[PDB]
Design a protein around this ligand. Structure first.
Ligand SMILES: CCCCCCCCCCCCCCCCCC(=O)OC[C@H](COP(=O)([O-])OCC(O)COP(=O)([O-])OC[C@@H](COC(=O)CCCCCCCCCCCCCCCCC)OC(=O)CCCCCCCCCCCCCCCCC)OC(=O)CCCCCCCCCCCCCCCCC
Ligand SMILES: CCCCCCCCCCCCCCCCCC(=O)OC[C@H](COP(=O)([O-])OCC[N+](C)(C)C)OC(=O)CCCCCCCCCCCCCCCCC
Ligand SMILES: CCCCCCCCCCCCCCCCCC(=O)OC[C@H](COP(=O)(O)OCCN)OC(=O)CCCCCCCCCCCCCCCCC
Ligand SMILES: NC(=O)C1=CN([C@@H]2O[C@H](COP(=O)(O)OP(=O)(O)OC[C@H]3O[C@@H](n4cnc5c(N)ncnc54)[C@H](OP(=O)(O)O)[C@@H]3O)[C@@H](O)[C@H]2O)C=CC1
Ligand code: SF4
Ligand code: SF4
Ligand code: SF4
Ligand code: SF4
Ligand code: SF4
Ligand SMILES: [K+]
Ligand SMILES: [Zn+2]
Lengths: 38, 102, 51, 341, 114, 207, 48, 176, 45, 95, 103, 94, 145, 154
């Protein structure tokens, strides 16, 4: 039977990543530019 | 476009040089798909579940080692035996931990 | 084989050691000689030939 | 800074600390911790060694590839000292014996060799020089070991005026000749002590405290031309200390007084070994020398190091001296020794 | 927003599992120090257990809590059965880590990392 | 029969297609997709609730008899809402045939353990938990199998770095092996190999 | 090689050396590239 | 087809039964096994007398790497970096620039011999036969750092071993 | 020039054994036992 | 030609030499600096320039399949020589 | 000496082979298969080659297929010598290992 | 091969075989270590005409999977039942 | 294309031409696409490039000794599909697969041209244009490059 | 004085290098070529090299294969349990410097992060003959030890 969970998905505590490389990182989401040589 | 040309051809023919250059840098692209392929290896059924995303690098490559399942049955096969018998049961399963552990 | 097959010491160390039934071998995921030892007639070179 | 000595990385094995250090006497007790702490952060360490190469093997895993460099040297050969120090930014002198051999006496190891290193290091243009002396170094001391330390400490001062001089108390650690020394007396039954160990006070200091203090002096610009006294946090009566050593080791303690004269006779009998003496007359004098109190000198605290109590680390050293029956006793099972407030 | 539970249907159920795990970890420390011949004290080990529980006190997903308890139980089983070695038990204390200052100036001196 | 082109076997393609719709007809509660590849491999894609019913039917049904679990693995696809694809590769000795069964799950959702269907699954599911973090419910003895004791993270996840986060060495001071943040003397060199020109039109995705 | 000698080249070693590891002739690695970034060298005269 | 390895019912005639009782009591099959190792005792052993005798190798053998030259003495390597791209172990590191005469040549060519898997892919990828795996297999060292080859080391290997390298390439290039 | 590559000899290779060959040896059980008792009786005598 | 710097350290064919004050030369103390003394830049300049009759010549480096990929070199510019981009041999159109 | 439970702890030779392969081209990944069952090298290569050939939809020439079966069976002999003789060696019969490792 | 006749006899009797016919040490029956050069053949695609790559391109004839069912009459089995193996006539019982 | 050759003749060889210190020309690699000619005339507004001769011997170039030194000259390297026109400063230093691409912005002027900074092993290797329809399209100035 | 200790080194060195007992310790692929060095063609036993399973009765550790993080504490343990003098031979790329798993999250990048190494044998795997070259190189290292000469001059 399904339960009602009412919070944003956070898996940071169960990913095994060190604290430094979660809070101090800055991720860039982008579509790569076309390599101008081709 | 899959197998590299002969060295003599690569040093004479423009197409051969291009394909040699590209096969040893990018490699051949593989059409998207997934296969489980197996053989009668000396230790048992050895298979790979190989996933291609269309690029020249495999996306996933799960390796099926027969020794993985054989070793998992070691406790089952050893019921009611002594220390020296388990030494024999490990041998009769023919285990190499390069394939078991990967 | 002149050293092992008929040797009573060898046979004492191997006969009735680690018996596995045919049904257990299949359900446990065994293959190769771990199946054929129990009588399961199966060899991928015969049933699913390659090359 | 030359571009190749500018620090890089996050301070790990593969980083670059910028320190190029020549450690003389790195193959002994204190040396292995100093080299370990330099290699941890990615320093270039030159280890000039006198012993057989097999006896330096424990140093190899301490640095990334290329970071530990071994050279031969002779304490009397000043050419072999320039080779080892002339590319360095700091030179660390840890040379010393607790006994005199047929070839080197206390003057050799505590005066002539320290002076030669400093004089050659000065000529090579070495920026920094760290010299280890002794808390109880004194010209008027009954121990000739300590008399040479005083002469050598002064000589290194004129030769290399900007040298950091460190004066540790007795150091305890896994490979020390201190806690191990007392624990080994069990092989003779009772534990002989001058005046029953009721007349001597000691302030032993942990090996890692000394090592961290040395490493912080290299990096601290204000440690130049200074003299430091590295002492532990608590002062003990010798009898209380040695009794505590036997409690942590769980060995039966049978103290009995031995007069000063008769217990030099035993010290003279052990000096006859052509090997490493089990004890010497000078060792007897040092062990029974009261540790000095030198408030005018900065201590470990002035180098950012917080001294480690003997109670936290005694079991680390003395567990191997227990029998099977007592190997697994916890740290709490033995009450701390009485301290001198 | 209706998802399949792992064990606990809500936070109150999950928290009971947390306390059952904490008791098991609390009771096991004296044996771990005795069995592994650790030089730390029973207090030091129990403080470390508290520290590991305290860093996850902000979770409010019963599923995330259940996975943490699942991993905690597995973590305890390795210790009790001495599958872990002393090196694995002492990895919680980072004894060879040189402390990394956390203020702006100290970081600014040492490098570019924020 | 062109020498360099793999021959196409259509009798098997028809046979696998027939059995594929046979499975879908019998188990409409769970089967979401059935497909056959150009090299003749049948895949059944099912709802995760149907792991035990589908696998049990395939093992026991007289017209299936997939008695051997060849392989049980997972694939991580971060772009999906359910990133983990769980893949069962089954073998039928009786009908000399293979079938693949696929389901899905995410980080926080468990999957029923198939150990009751195939005892071979015991270690496969431990490997999937160890390397991907997918929890299997009612598993007899679930715990890491391949990674080091105390290892944190699930290495085969695409967002786990290749060299991990920590590394080991022997420290003489503490007289033991210690773990420290990973630093590499030579960073792994990332190569951008993909050609900017489409290779396989037949697989082109509509815009 | 008495019957079928190797082809001669002016760059081939005329003197074979055995394994020199553990001797003063041992190979020591080093980077073979030149300095990448050139630092600014301040003037030699005071103006300030 | 298949055969049975162990499915034979032994005969029960008093001669066969008496034969097996003799086997059990007189140890005849254990004596027979002693005959085999006795026969080996009087065979010439297969041991070669290393290092005065060597094991046989072929011209394809994959050993220590070396950078080759043209007969003029010019380097063959043109810094194409195909070997660096194909290296499964990422054991090759290259930097290049125009030489003083404009030639395309490397300024760095490192092989980390403790990363290398001695797979020979680099010499397959090279279009000019610059990098090869020579026939030398006896170059164990006393330090790790001695196995991190730079360009000077590899060029010396080429000059050291060129006489043999050329003869092996001559014997096998027609299979390539 | 004609193609030259590693090939079998034109006629093919000679036969290759593979079947188990463990030859029979020794004397009957009766003969072995008879020799032993004959030895014993002479020993006793 | 292999040169020695004022510090005495040999200069490699890539121009590398630890400058005076670089601690990294301690790695050579008690050992040696591996330097190849057959500078390819020097050796190729000793080859004679080959006079040919055609406007275009091809170079495979010699040895057929054992050389380099076959290229073709234009020789219309009479102020300079045609150089092979693989092996560095020079060619010249004779009148 | 009676065994009441066997608990095989593996991973002492786990080397993230499967994760490493994702960072390689198809050719670059082939040598990883030599080092799995490192007694049966050429058979592991064959299994991986068949999977890639199947995905590529190409066919190796007849001679290569015969060389593959030839060396696959030579490889099977290498495996079974190692399997049987090391199995005998563990059980105490050390001599066959020496006779058959010369083969 | 250098063993004397008496020793040849002795190890033949002890082993129960004729060991000399099948020695495990190799002598001069092996191939010479210097061979003549090969001249290897070329493949089917080495033609000057009627050889367009688009008629022999295996990768481009690969197609995506056929969707049999997507949730977006007689019973069948995956294949015909396997035939029962027959016993060997070469040597049925080892 | 096909995977092999059936050309059994000798190849054309063309002499090289100097057009300044920024663009190296290996004109034997030219495939006569005329992109460079059109870019120079239309985008750079410079009419120095063109074809001379005809047939197989048609040669792209300037005819006379002349340097193509526009502020937009370096862009002909990008639009040339082959290695006929390449960057002299960049020559031989890297290969495309091994570069890391950092998408950044140019500060040589106030136009804010979008660029890709190619790096390798911690070193800046070259600067490439980044397409932005509303700023620099797919070109950058020579100074930016 | 000098003459007596000089001969005494020659004697203890000769005995130690003529009687080298490696630990029965192999890790992966390279252990197969270690077996081939014990096999008849090379016969390590003829040099006086004899495998013994117990660390207490072993002089040399041949690290033959990949060292994982999980295995690393065990390898250090059995090394520490060898009596001295003891030697370590690093065999193959994996042991030498991680090799083809150098960038793996679970592999120690060279066994010399865990133990001191006397000899590094390159190859993947080194041939049986190459390992025999390394063992004989270790013997010649032991032939040069100067334990008593240095002791005499202390
Ligand atoms: C106490 C016991 C020990 C002391 C007794 C000493 C007795 C004399 C030993 C003489 C051996 C000399 C061998 C020889 O001639 O080398 C030639 C050899 C040249 O011959 P080759 O070109 O190599 O060819 C050899 C044959 O082709 C290939 O060799 P082969 O296999 O053909 O053997 C040749 C010859 C070699 O045999 C002998 O010459 C000595 C026979 C003494 C038997 C004692 C038992 O044997 C025979 O001719 C057959 C008769 C030998 C008796 C066999 C009995 C077997 C036991 C019965 C089975 C049941 C066992 C349970 O030159 C050498 O290598 C010299 C090496 C020197 C080694 C030391 C020799 C002294 C041995 C120890 C003495 C004490 C110290
Ligand atoms: C079947 C029976 C066979 C018996 C065979 C017995 C061996 C016969 C060969 C003997 C040759 C001499 C062996 C010397 C080996 C010493 C060990 C060694 O190498 O250590 C290096 C040490 C050198 O150590 P070191 O001083 O340089 O430094 C040690 C400190 N670290 C580790 C930090 C470097 O040698 C010595 O200390 C002294 C050498 C003595 C040589 C002469 C032997 C006299 C020993 C007497 C000991 C006193 C107790 C009496 C014991 C009874 C004696 C019979
Ligand atoms: C006039 C009236 C006369 C009255 C007296 C007449 C008596 C004559 C008949 C007596 C019987 C003769 C045999 C006596 C010897 C003992 C026989 C024996 O015990 O053999 C049986 C034993 C077990 O064999 P097994 O088949 O496994 O067990 C039975 C199965 N349930 O088998 C074994 O022992 C197995 C041994 C394994 C270990 C063997 C290793 C060494 C083998 C080589 C040694 C060869 C002999 C060397 C003799 C040296 C003498 C100096
Ligand atoms: N309790 C303590 O440990 C205290 C130590 N100190 C001082 O700290 C320094 C190191 O202490 P510790 O490390 O315990 O001393 P150790 O004896 O443990 O090591 C001393 C070092 O000096 C070297 N050495 C000794 N004599 C000579 C010589 N004649 N020629 C060349 N090298 C020589 C040794 O090299 P080899 O190994 O080759 O002989 C060794 O590496 C010494 O100066 C000591 O006096 C000060 C206060 C207390
Ligand atoms: S042999 Fe293989 S692993 Fe070694 S350098 Fe060449 S390509 Fe790289
Ligand atoms: S060695 Fe060969 S493949 Fe490698 S960069 Fe040089 S020319 Fe290219
Ligand atoms: S852009 Fe390049 S290929 Fe096209 S005409 Fe100009 S030089 Fe030739
Ligand atoms: S890389 Fe392109 S332009 Fe350069 S030679 Fe090859 S095909 Fe021609
Ligand atoms: S070095 Fe090579 S052969 Fe040895 S274990 Fe590693 S991969 Fe296997
Ligand atoms: K271009
Ligand atoms: Zn050329």
């Amino acid at each position: 039977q399904l339960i009602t969970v009412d919070e944003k998905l956070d898996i940071t505590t169960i990913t095994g990543v060190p604290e430094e490389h979660i809070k101090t990182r800055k991720a860039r989401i982008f579509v790569p530019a076309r390599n101008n040589m081709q | 476009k899959v197998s590299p040309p002969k060295r003599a051809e690569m040093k004479t023919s423009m197409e051969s040089l291009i394909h040699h250059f590209k096969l040893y840098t990018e490699g051949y692209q593989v059409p998207p798909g997934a296969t489980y392929t197996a053989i009668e290896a000396p230790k048992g059924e050895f298979g790979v579940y190989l996933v291609s995303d269309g690029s020249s690098r495999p996306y996933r490559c799960k390796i099926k080692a027969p020794g993985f399942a054989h070793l998992a049955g070691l406790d089952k096969m050893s019921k009611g035996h002594m220390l020296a018998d388990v030494v024999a049961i490990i041998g009769t399963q023919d285990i190499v931990f390069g394939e078991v552990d990967r | 084989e002149e050293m092992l097959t008929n040797n009573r010491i060898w046979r004492n160390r191997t006969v009735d050691i680690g018996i596995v039934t045919a049904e257990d071998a299949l359900n446990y995921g065994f293959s190769g000689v771990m199946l054929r030892g129990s009588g399961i007639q199966w060899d991928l070179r015969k049933t699913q030939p390659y090359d | 800074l030359h571009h190749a000595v500018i620090p890089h990385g996050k301070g790990g094995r593969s980083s670059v600390s910028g320190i190029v250090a020549t450690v003389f006497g790195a193959t002994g007790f204190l040396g292995r911790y100093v080299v370990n702490h330099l290699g941890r952060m990615g320093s270039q360490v030159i280890v000039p060694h006198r012993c057989e190469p097999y006896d330096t093997m424990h140093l190899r895993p301490m640095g990334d590839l290329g970071q530990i460099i071994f050279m031969d040297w002779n304490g009397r050969d000043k050419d072999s000292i320039r080779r080892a120090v002339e590319h360095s930014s700091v030179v660390i002198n840890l040379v010393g014996r607790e006994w005199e051999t047929q070839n080197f006496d206390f003057e050799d190891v505590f005066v002539k060799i320290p002076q030669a290193i400093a004089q050659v290091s000065k000529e090579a243009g070495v920026e920094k020089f760290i010299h280890i002396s002794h808390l109880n170094a004194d010209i008027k001391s009954s121990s000739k070991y300590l008399r040479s330390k005083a002469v050598g400490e002064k000589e290194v001062r004129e030769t290399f005026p900007e040298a950091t001089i460190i004066k540790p108390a007795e150091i305890f650690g896994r490979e020390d000749r201190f806690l191990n020394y007392f624990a080994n007396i069990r092989w003779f039954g009772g534990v002989p002590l001058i005046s029953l160990g009721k007349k001597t006070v000691k302030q032993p200091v942990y090996i890692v405290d000394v090592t961290k203090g040395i490493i912080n002096a290299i990096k601290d610009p204000d440690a130049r031309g200074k003299t430091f006294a590295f002492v532990g946090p608590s002062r003990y009566l010798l009898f209380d200390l040695v009794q505590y050593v036997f409690a942590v080791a769980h060995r039966p303690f049978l103290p009995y007084p031995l007069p000063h004269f008769a217990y030099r006779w035993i010290g003279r009998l052990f000096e006859i070994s052509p090997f490493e003496p089990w004890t010497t007359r000078d060792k007897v004098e040092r062990i029974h020398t009261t540790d000095k109190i030198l408030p005018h000198l900065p201590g470990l605290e002035d180098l950012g190091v917080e001294a480690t109590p003997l109670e936290l680390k005694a079991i680390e050293v003395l567990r191997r001296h227990r029998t099977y029956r007592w190997l697994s006793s916890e740290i709490e099972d033995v009450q701390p020794a009485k301290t001198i407030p | 927003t209706s998802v399949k539970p792992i064990f606990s249907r809500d936070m109150n159920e999950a928290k009971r599992r947390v306390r059952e795990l904490y008791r098991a970890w609390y009771r096991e420390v004296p044996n771990t120090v005795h069995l592994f011949q650790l030089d730390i004290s029973v207090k030091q080990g129990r403080d470390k257990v508290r520290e590991m529980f305290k860093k996850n006190a902000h979770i409010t997903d019963p599923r995330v809590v259940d996975l943490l308890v699942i991993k905690g139980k597995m973590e305890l089983e390795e210790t009790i059965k001495v599958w872990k070695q002393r090196t694995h038990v002492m990895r919680f204390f980072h004894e060879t880590e040189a402390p990394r200052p956390k203020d702006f100036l100290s970081k600014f001196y040492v490098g570019h990392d924020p | 029969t062109r020498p360099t082109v793999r021959p196409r076997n259509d009798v098997a393609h028809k046979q696998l297609s027939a059995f594929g719709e046979y499975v879908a007809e019998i188990l409409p509660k769970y089967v979401q997709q059935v497909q056959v590849s150009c090299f003749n491999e049948l895949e059944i894609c099912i709802h995760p609730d149907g792991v035990i019913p589908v696998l049990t039917f395939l093992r026991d049904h007289s017209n299936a008899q997939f008695k051997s679990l060849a392989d049980l693995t997972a694939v991580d696809i971060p772009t999906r809402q359910n990133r983990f694809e769980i893949v069962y590769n089954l073998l039928s000795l009786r009908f000399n045939s293979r079938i693949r069964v696929k389901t899905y799950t995410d980080e926080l959702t468990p999957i029923e353990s198939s150990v009751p269907v195939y005892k071979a699954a015991n270690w496969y599911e431990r490997e999937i938990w160890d390397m991907f973090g997918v929890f299997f419910a009612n598993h007899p003895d679930l715990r890491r199998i391949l990674t080091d004791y105390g290892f944190e993270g699930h290495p085969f996840r695409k967002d786990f770095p290749l060299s991990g986060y920590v590394e080991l060495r022997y420290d003489d001071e503490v007289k033991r092996v210690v773990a420290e943040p990973v630093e590499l003397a030579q960073e792994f060199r990332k190569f951008d190999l993909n050609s900017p020109w489409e290779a396989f039109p037949a697989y082109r995705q509509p815009p | 090689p008495t019957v079928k000698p190797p082809t001669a080249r002016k760059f081939i070693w005329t003197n074979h050396k055995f394994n020199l590891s553990g001797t003063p002739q041992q190979y020591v690695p080093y980077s073979t590239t030149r300095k990448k970034i050139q630092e600014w060298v301040p003037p030699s005269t005071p103006y300030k | 087809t298949y055969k049975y390895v162990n499915l034979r019912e032994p005969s029960m005639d008093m001669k066969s039964v008496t034969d097996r009782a003799a086997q059990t009591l007189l140890w005849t099959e254990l004596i027979r096994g002693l005959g085999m190792t006795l026969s080996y005792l009087f065979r010439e052993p297969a041991t070669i007398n290393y290092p005065f005798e060597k094991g046989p190798l072929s011209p394809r053998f994959r050993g220590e790497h070396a950078l080759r030259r043209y007969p003029s003495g010019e380097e063959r390597c043109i810094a194409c970096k195909l070997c660096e791209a194909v290296c499964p172990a990422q054991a090759i590191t290259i930097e290049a620039e125009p030489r003083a005469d404009g030639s395309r040549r490397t300024t760095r060519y490192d092989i980390d011999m403790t990363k290398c898997i001695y797979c020979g892919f680099c010499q397959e990828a090279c279009p000019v036969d610059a990098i090869v795996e020579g026939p030398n297999f006896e170059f164990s060292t006393e330090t790790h750092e001695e196995l991190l080859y730079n360009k000077e080391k590899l060029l010396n290997n080429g000059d050291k071993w060129e006489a043999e390298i050329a003869a092996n390439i001559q014997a096998d290039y027609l299979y390539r | 020039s004609k193609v030259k590559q590693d090939m079998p000899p034109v006629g093919g290779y000679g036969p290759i054994d593979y079947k188990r060959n463990l030859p029979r040896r020794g004397l009957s059980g009766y003969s072995m036992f008879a020799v032993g008792i004959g030895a014993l009786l002479f020993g006793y005598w | 030609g292999v040169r020695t710097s004022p510090t005495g350290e040999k200069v490699t064919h890539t121009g590398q030499v630890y400058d005076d004050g670089d601690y990294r030369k301690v790695r050579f103390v008690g050992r040696q600096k591996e330097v190849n003394e057959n500078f390819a830049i020097d050796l190729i300049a000793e080859q004679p320039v080959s006079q040919v009759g055609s406007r275009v010549i091809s170079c495979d480096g010699g040895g057929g399949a054992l050389g380099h990929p076959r290229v073709y070199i234009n020789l219309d510019k009479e102020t300079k020589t045609g150089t092979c981009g693989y092996c560095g041999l020079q060619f010249r159109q004779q009148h | 000496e009676m065994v009441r439970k066997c608990d095989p702890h593996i991973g002492l030779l786990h080397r993230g082979t499967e994760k490493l392969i994702e960072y390689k081209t198809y050719l670059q990944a082939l040598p990883y298969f030599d080092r799995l069952d490192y007694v049966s090298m050429m058979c592991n290569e064959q299994a991986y080659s068949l999977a890639v050939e199947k995905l590529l939809n190409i066919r190796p020439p007849p001679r290569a297929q015969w060389i593959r079966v030839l060396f696959g069976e030579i490889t099977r002999l290498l495996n079974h010598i190692m399997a049987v003789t090391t199995h005998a060696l563990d059980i105490g019969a050390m001599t066959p290992f020496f006779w058959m490792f010369e083969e | 091969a250098s063993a004397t006749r008496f020793i040849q006899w002795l190890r033949n009797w002890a082993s129960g075989r004729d060991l000399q016919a099948k020695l495990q040490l190799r002598y001069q029956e092996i191939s010479k270590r210097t061979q003549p050069p090969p001249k290897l053949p070329v493949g089917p695609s080495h033609k000057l005409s009627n050889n367009y790559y688009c008629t022999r391109d295996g990768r481009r004839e690969a197609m995506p999977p056929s969707i049999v069912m997507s949730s977006q009459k007689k019973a069948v089995s995956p294949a015909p039942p396997i035939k029962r193996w027959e016993l060997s006539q070469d040597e049925p019982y080892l | 294309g096909s995977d092999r050759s059936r050309f059994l003749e000798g190849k054309r060889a063309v002499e090289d031409k100097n057009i300044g210190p920024l663009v190296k020309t290996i004109m034997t690699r030219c495939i006569q696409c005329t992109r460079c000619i059109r870019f120079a005339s239309e985008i750079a507004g410079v009419d120095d490039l063109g074809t001379t001769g005809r047939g197989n011997d048609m040669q792209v170039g300037t005819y006379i000794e002349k340097m193509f030194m526009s502020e937009l000259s370096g862009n002909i390297i990008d639009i040339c599909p082959v290695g006929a026109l390449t960057s002299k400063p960049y020559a031989f230093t890297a290969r495309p697969w091994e570069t890391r691409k950092t998408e950044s912005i140019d500060v040589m002027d106030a136009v804010g041209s979008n660029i890709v900074v190619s790096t390798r092993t911690g070193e800046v290797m070259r600067i490439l244009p980044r397409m932005h329809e509303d700023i620099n399209e797919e070109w950058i100035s020579d100074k930016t490059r | 004085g000098e003459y007596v200790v000089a001969k005494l080194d020659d004697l203890i060195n000769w005995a130690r290098r003529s009687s080298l007992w490696p630990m029965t310790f192999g890790l992966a692929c390279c252990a197969v070529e270690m077996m081939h060095m014990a096999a008849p063609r090379y016969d390590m036993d003829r040099f006086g090299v004899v495998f013994r399973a117990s660390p207490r009765q072993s002089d040399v550790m041949i690290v033959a294969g990949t060292l994982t993080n999980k295995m690393a504490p065990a390898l250090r343990k059995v090394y520490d349990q060898m009596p001295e003098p003891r030697y370590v031979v690093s065999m193959g790329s994996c042991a030498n410097g991680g090799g083809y798993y150098h960038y793996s999250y679970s592999v120690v990048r060279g066994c010399d992060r865990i133990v001191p190494v006397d000899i590094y044998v390159p190859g993947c795997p080194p041939t049986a003959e190459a390992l025999l070259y390394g063992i004989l190189q270790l013997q010649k290292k032991i032939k040069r030890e100067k334990r008593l000469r240095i002791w005499y001059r202390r």
